[PDB]
Every structure is written in C-alpha cells, then in structure tokens.
Amino acid sequence: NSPTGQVFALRAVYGKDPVAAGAKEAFHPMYGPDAMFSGQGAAKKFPALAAS
Amino acid sequence: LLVRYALSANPYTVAKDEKEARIIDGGDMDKMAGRSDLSVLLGVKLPKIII
Amino acid sequence: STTTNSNSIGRPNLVALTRATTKLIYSDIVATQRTNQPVAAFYGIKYLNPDN
Amino acid sequence: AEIGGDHGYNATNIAAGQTSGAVTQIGPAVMGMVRRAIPNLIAFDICGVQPM
Numbered sequence: 173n174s175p176t177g178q179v180f181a182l183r184a185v186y187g188k189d190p191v192a193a194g195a196k197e198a199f200h201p202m203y204g205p206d207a208m209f210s211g212q213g214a215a216k217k218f219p220a221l222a223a224s
Numbered sequence: 225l226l227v228r229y230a231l232s233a234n235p236y237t238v239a240k241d242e243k244e245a246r247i248i249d250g251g252d253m254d255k256m257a258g259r260s261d262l263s264v265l266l267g268v269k270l271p272k273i274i275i
Numbered sequence: 276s277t278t279t280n281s282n283s284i285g286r287p288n289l290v291a292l293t294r295a296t297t298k299l300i301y302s303d304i305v306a307t308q309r310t311n312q313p314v315a316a317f318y319g320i321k322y323l324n325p326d327n
Numbered sequence: 328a329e330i331g332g333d334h335g336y337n338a339t340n341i342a343a344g345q346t347s348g349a350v351t352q353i354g355p356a357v358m359g360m361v362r363r364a365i366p367n368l369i370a371f372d373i374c375g376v377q378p379m
Contacts, residue, residue: 176334176341178285178355182362190281199363235293246351247343286354 234262 185195186209196206208218233250237260242248250256332348334341344352 174352174356176344176352176355177358178342179358180283180285180360182360184363188276190277197363199366201364201366205366236295247345285357289353 233260236261 184198186198186206187195189195197203198205206213230251233256235248235250237250237256238245238248239252239255240259242255330348331350332346334346334352340346342355344354346352
C-alpha cells in the first residue's frame with residue numbers, strides 16, 4: 173500500500189553479543205543445535221579439531 | 225528513573241554548508257548551531273554583580 | 276546482552292506537519308466590490324465653490 | 328513540473344527515504360516479520376522415561 177516496502181527477519185543466536193561476527197544461529201534448519209552450550213560446554217572450554 | 229525524548233529542531237532549518245538536502249536531521253546541535261529561523265538570540269553586556 | 280542496536284527500527288512516526296503561509300492582508304487594507312463587467316467605472320462627484 | 332522521482336535503488340537510500348524528485352517518503356511500509364521455524368522433538372518414549 174506504499175512504495176518501497178520493508179520486511180524484517182529475526183535471526184536468533186546464542187552468545188554474549190548477538191551481533192559480533194561469527195555468531196552461530198540458534199534454530200538453524202541445516203545446522204544442528206549445539207547440544208553442549210547449555211551442558212558441559214558451559215563448564216569448560218573444548219578445543220576444536222584442526223589441521224595436525 | 226529513565227526518560228526518553230527526541231528534542232529536535234524545527235524544519236526549514238537546513239544546516240550550513242549543506243543547504244540543499246532532504247534528509248536533514250534537526251537533532252545534531254553540532255551541525256544545527258545557529259542555523260535556525262524561528263528563534264533569535266541576543267545577549268546583554270552588563271556590569272558584574274559584586275559578591 | 277541484546278541492546279537497542281540489535282533491533283532495527285521501522286517507519287519513523289510522522290509527528291508534525293509544517294506549512295508556510297504569510298499573514299496575507301488585503302481584505303483589511305483595501306475596499307473591494309465585485310464587478311459584473313470587464314470594465315469597472317467609479318464616480319467621483321465633487322462639490323465646488325464658484326472658483327471651482 | 329514537479330516530477331515524482333524515485334529511489335536510486337540503494338538500500339541505503341530506500342530505508343531512509345532519500346528520493347530524487349519531490350515529496351521524500353516518510354519511510355518504507357511493514358510487510359511483516361519472518362522468524363525461523365522451531366525444530367520438532369524426537370519422542371523420548373523410544374528409551375526409558377522414569378520420572379525421578
């Protein structure tokens with residue numbers, strides 16, 4: 173009903189800062205939920221696999 | 225307590241050195257200094273009050 | 276810590292309109308009367324002494 | 328004679344309402360908001376459910 177309309181999106185993420193680069197989306201259809209953030213992952217820091 | 229307000233300047237108050245523009249923000253006093261029309265200031269020089 | 280920088284505002288509200296019109300003054304400054312023909316004729320009748 | 332003008336097809340301009348002709352727009356419309364769907368849960372009846 174008016175030119176140049178708008179539409180919003182509601183990316184839900186987990187992390188201290190929801191706008192920092194690299195934040196992972198919470199309810200992603202392709203990406204499985206990180207089922208350690210609310211669990212043991214809050215107690216320690218698991219290193220990530222890499223090369224060598 | 226929290227209070228929020230806009231406190232903008234009135235229209236027809238384009239900022240200097242900009243003149244022609246149509247998104248003019250009448251809130252940034254740093255650019256709106258003096259560039260108003262609906263109000264005029266005039267100071268007065270008077271002898272000091274002794275305290 | 277979702278601040279106000281996450282939510283993006285939509286259409287700003289239009290609070291006030293501001294037209295510019297002069298205090299037009301001609302009804303009080305002059306004397307008007309509607310003329311019914313493209314030529315308007317006024318009568319000036321003067322009272323004269325025997326020296327005109 | 329006062330062309331309507333248009334937005335320069337720049338998301339910078341379109342959101343702010345910066346136009347090219349006259350009567351700069353108040354702002355976009357609001358077509359709605361789309362949020363991510365909620366993943367469904369696998370019923371726990373496959374394994375033992377013993378309320379403690």
